Paper text:
The [name] (AR) is the cellular mediator of the actions of the hormone 5-α dihydrotestosterone (DHT). Androgen binding to AR leads to activation of genes involved in the development and maintenance of the male reproductive system and other tissues such as bone and muscle. AR is distinguished from other nuclear receptors in that after hormone binding, it preferentially responds to a specialized set of coactivators bearing aromatic-rich motifs, while responding poorly to coactivators bearing the leucine-rich “NR box” motifs favored by other nuclear receptors. Structures of AR in complex with FxxLF, [name], FxxLW, WxxLF, WxxVW, FxxFF, and FxxYF motifs reveal a changing surface of the AR coactivator binding interface that permits accommodation of both AR-specific aromatic-rich motifs and canonical leucine-rich motifs.
The preference of AR for motifs with aromatic groups over leucine-rich motifs was assessed with a crystal structure of the AR LBD in complex with the [name] peptide. The [name] motif adopts a helical conformation, and interactions of the motif with the AF-2 cleft are predominantly hydrophobic, with the three leucine residues of the motif contributing most of the interactions. Second, the [name] peptide backbone forms hydrogen bonds with only one of the two conserved charge clamp residues, Lys720. A shift in the position of the [name] peptide helix precludes direct interactions with Glu897. This shift results from changes in the geometry of the +1 and +5 subsites mediated by Met734, which moves 2.5Å toward the +1 pocket and enables binding of a leucine at the +5 subsite by a simultaneous widening and shallowing of the pocket. Side chains of residues flanking the first leucine of the motif make additional hydrophobic interactions with the AR surface. Trp+2 reaches over Met734, clamping the methionine in between itself and Leu+1. Leu−1 extends over Met894, abutted against Glu893. These interactions likely explain the moderate affinity of AR for this particular [name] motif despite suboptimal complimentarity with the residues of the core motif ( ) and the loss of main chain interactions with Glu897.
Residue numbers in the entry:
A (entry chain B): 99 to 106
B (entry chain A): 669 to 918
The structure:
């Protein structure tokens, strides 16, 4: 998700 | 001796975030909640950038880094909103953002008046307890590590260590100008009670947003991508009791 991308 | 930990928390504290709400239009449930949702999406971006810069956060398994953010965002954001409301308008209104300030009329129009008054009460506590900016920063950081799953995190041990260290830092902040162990104990009692008070509020909001997401299409409320994913996947784990807050008191 966009959150995962944001986190990584 | 420089306060390294506190220096870091102050340095990474997010700046002002606006909701993009049109305050020239008459208030409406759909517009108000759509703006709150957009503000949530915008703040989530800042919370992730902030969390990743917290001392020791990277020690957590990446899957756990994700989890803690997904479960604690509501509490984190409500706590910060309460602080803004206190500092900016002395709790007279809920300061969600410079362009999204809730007066009683908006609290009613939002259909979450009960939750709003509880958040206003939280805001008032910052003043009644004379919470310092530094106590606020440490407590907010601790809120990121205050809700975990029953099946445990990928590496529960690293999380437990990090949480313990943040509690330790809160102790240090309390003992700063306090040379009396009893005064420190009384302050710790006050702050842990305040921290605990955030959870029931966050739960009520979790329930409200979940219900709103389920019927969003018929009430014309828009949910941004990340918010919709988190509220449909992570929030229900909290509501179904699979993920629970860590309360200091019982
Ligand atoms: C976290 C936010 C937005 C950021 C903030 O300042 C606190 C506030 C608390 C109420 C939340 C809102 C985001 C959108 C939600 C979750 C709505 O769907 C219903 C409750 C709202």
């Amino acid at each position: 998700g966009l959150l995962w991308d944001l986190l990584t | 001796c420089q306060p390294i930990f506190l220096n870091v928390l102050e340095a990474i504290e997010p700046g002002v975030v606006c909701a993009g709400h049109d305050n020239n239009q008459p208030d409406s449930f759909a517009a108000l909640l759509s703006s709150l949702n957009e503000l949530g999406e915008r703040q989530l971006v800042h919370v992730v950038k902030w969390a990743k810069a917290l001392p020791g956060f990277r020690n957590l398994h990446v899957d756990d880094q994700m989890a803690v953010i997904q479960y604690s965002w509501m509490g984190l954001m409500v706590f910060a909103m309460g602080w803004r409301s206190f500092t900016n308008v002395n709790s007279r209104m809920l300061y969600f953002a410079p362009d999204l300030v809730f007066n009683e009329y908006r609290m009613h129009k939002s259909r979450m008046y009960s939750q709003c008054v509880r958040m206003r009460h939280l805001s008032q506590e910052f003043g009644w307890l004379q919470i310092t900016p530094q106590e606020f920063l440490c407590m907010k950081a601790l809120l990121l590590f205050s809700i975990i799953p029953v099946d445990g995190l990928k590496n529960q041990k690293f999380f437990d260590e990090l949480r313990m260290n943040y509690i330790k830092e809160l102790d240090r902040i309390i003992a700063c100008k306090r040379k009396n162990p009893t005064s420190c104990s009384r302050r710790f009692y006050q702050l842990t009670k305040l921290l605990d008070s955030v959870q029931p509020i966050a739960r009520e909001l979790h329930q409200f947003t979940f219900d709103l997401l389920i019927k969003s299409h018929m009430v014309s409320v828009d949910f941004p991508e990340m918010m919709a994913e988190i509220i449909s996947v992570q929030v229900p784990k909290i509501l179904s009791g699979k993920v629970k807050p860590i309360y200091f008191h019982t």
